[PDB]
């Protein structure tokens, strides 16, 4: 529709970035994808597609592919500190994060994609943006859109401190790989007590398992960005917590995939400035406790590209983007806050108490998943 706007750079290859490139190309734009790392994220943890994000995936033609790769867990076991089994548990879809990225990348094979391109600077002009990569390459684009995640390097570069802040929800999450020493088979076992959750999961590969930790604490690691300090923080919180906690902490240094972070949300009044925009976690992260981050990344890419297809100019498009997505961002971020405060139990739940909570979580979560209708373009 609009002229002069065809050439668009998209920064980061995870969920929103590749999905955005698909739709921009579909609508006749000329997207280029760049990623700071040498490769896309491989493997990772399990994520969900819910509500209108499923419709996005169907309209993209990836829904069948996502089902083919979905998680296979046969049972979920809840145990007490002694390890006694309290109870078992044995359209939306769950898929390992890296598997969804892989599926998304395969839809854009015709799109230029450059890895190991870290960005040195972004200079806004009246009619374009000049990007200088750290490798020396300099190029002009009509628009630039940053998909590069919670910690986005582009956001801090483009937006002033007054435009955004990161809300810390007072919780922490950690995941690392372990041998499957319990020899679990397509099973996840959890201990939930004392505002803390410990989990062991083995699904597709019986020689592998994944430890996970989620807890609420007002303290912090002594150095938040330092892996060793993070591990020390986990030891302090989980030593003698019950079940396998101590064993998992001892395997922690053999992991080699370790992941740790505070639960955080990105809060902005406007996700766009001039000719630059943010999509996915870089703008609005709801956080892992919401479980809605992937859905919001997909819907965010869908609407931004559709408004750019519709509008007279990018300024009008960016305004509609902010307006239509805001209620969805707000509802999903409020769900993450509710989880951070109200979810974790003080002591293990019975089979009946777990059932009651699950129904409450589903009802509260529905307010987020159904918050808006998917626009048509």
Known binding residues for FAD: 13-16, 35-37, 45-48, 97, 259, 281, 288-294
| Nearest CA among 152, 257, 261 for reference residue 215 | 261
Binding site as annotated, residues: 13-16, 35-37, 45-48, 97, 259, 281, 288-294
| Alpha-carbon span 47 to 99, nearest angstrom | 10
Q: CA–CA distance from 368 to each of 293, 307, 335, 342 (Å)?
A: 11, 22, 7, 16
Where b means 16+ CB within 10 Å and e means fewer, 136-161 reads eeeeebbbbbbbbbbebbbbeebbee
Q: 129-133 and 138-141: which strand pairing?
A: antiparallel
How far CA 198 is from CA of 184, 189, 323, 362, in Å, comes to 15, 8, 39, 22
Distance CA 154, CA 282 (A): 8
Contact criterion met (CB below 8 Å) for 13 and 113: yes
Exposure on the CB side of residue 342, measured as CA atoms within 13 A: 13
Instruction: Please give the structure tokens belonging to residue 247.
Output: 């064993």
The SS3 call for residue 146 is strand
Q: What is the distance between the alpha carbons of residues 198 and 188, in angstroms, rounded to a whole number?
A: 10
Tell me which residue of 324, 275, 310 sits closest to 123, measured CA to CA: 275
Tokens 């319990």 correspond to: 182
Pick the closest to residue 100 from 49, 134, 169, 35 (CA basis).
49
CA distance 49 to 57: 8
Q: Show the beta-strand stretches assigned E in the chain.
A: 7-11, 30-34, 46-49, 75-79, 85-89, 93-96, 113-114, 119-124, 129-133, 138-141, 143-146, 164-179, 187-193, 196-202, 208-216, 259-268, 272-273, 276-278
Distance between alpha carbon 321 and the CA centroid of its chain, in Å? Answer: 20
* Experimental method reported for this structure: X-ray
Residue 185: count other Cβ atoms within 10 Å of its Cβ: 12
For residue 71, count CB atoms less than 10 angstroms from its CB and return exposed for 0-12, middle for 13-18, buried for 19 or more: middle
Cα distance between residue 157 and residue 123, in whole Å: 10
Nearest CA among 292, 333, 279 for reference residue 144: 279
- What is the spatial distance between Cα 367 and Cα 355, in angstroms, rounded to a whole number? 19
């Amino acid at each position: 529709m609009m002229p002069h706007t065809k050439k668009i750079l998209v920064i980061g290859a995870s969920i929103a970035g590749p999905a955005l490139c698909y739709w921009l190309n579909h609508y006749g734009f000329q997207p280029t994808l760049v990623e700071k790392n040498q490769s896309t994220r491989k493997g990772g943890y399990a994520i969900d597609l819910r509500g209108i994000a499923v419709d996005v995936a169907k309209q993209m033609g990836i829904y069948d592919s996502v089902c083919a790769m979905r998680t296979s867990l046969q049972c979920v076991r809840y145990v007490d500190a002694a390890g006694n089994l309290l109870f078992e548990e044995h359209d939306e879809v769950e898929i390992v994060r890296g598997d969804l990225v892989d599926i998304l990348m395969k839809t854009i094979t015709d799109i230029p994609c450059f890895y190991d391109h870290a960005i040195e600077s972004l200079t806004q002009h009246d009619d374009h943006v000049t990007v200088q990569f750290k490798n020396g390459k300099t190029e002009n684009y009509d628009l630039v859109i940053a998909a590069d995640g919670l910690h986005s390097a582009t956001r801090r570069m483009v937006f002033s401190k007054d435009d955004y802040h990161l809300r810390n929800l007072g919780c922490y999450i950690s995941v690392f790989s372990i041998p499957n020493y319990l020899q679990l088979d397509h099973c996840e076992t959890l201990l939930e007590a004392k505002q803390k959750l410990v989990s062991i999961t083995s699904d597709k590969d019986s020689t592998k398992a994944f430890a996970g930790f989620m807890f609420r604490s007002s303290n912090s690691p002594n150095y938040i960005r330092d892996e060793a300090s993070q591990k020390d923080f986990l030891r302090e919180n989980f030593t003698n917590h019950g079940w396998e906690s101590n064993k998992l902490l001892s395997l922690m240094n053999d992991a080699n995939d370790f992941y740790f972070d505070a639960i955080m949300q990105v809060k902005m009044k406007d996700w766009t400035k001039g000719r630059i925009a943010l999509v996915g976690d870089a703008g609005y992260t709801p956080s892992p406790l919401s479980g809605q981050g992937t859905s919001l990344a997909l819907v965010g890419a869908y609407i931004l590209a559709g408004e750019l297809k519709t509008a007279t100019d990018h300024v009008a498009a960016f305004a509609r983007y902010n307006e239509l997505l805001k209620p969805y961002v707000e509802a999903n971020q409020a769900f993450g806050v509710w989880v951070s405060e109200s979810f974790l139990a003080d002591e293990p739940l019975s089979a009946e108490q777990a059932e009651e909570r699950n129904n409450i979580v589903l009802g509260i979560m529905k307010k987020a998943t159904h918050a808006i209708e998917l626009p048509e373009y």
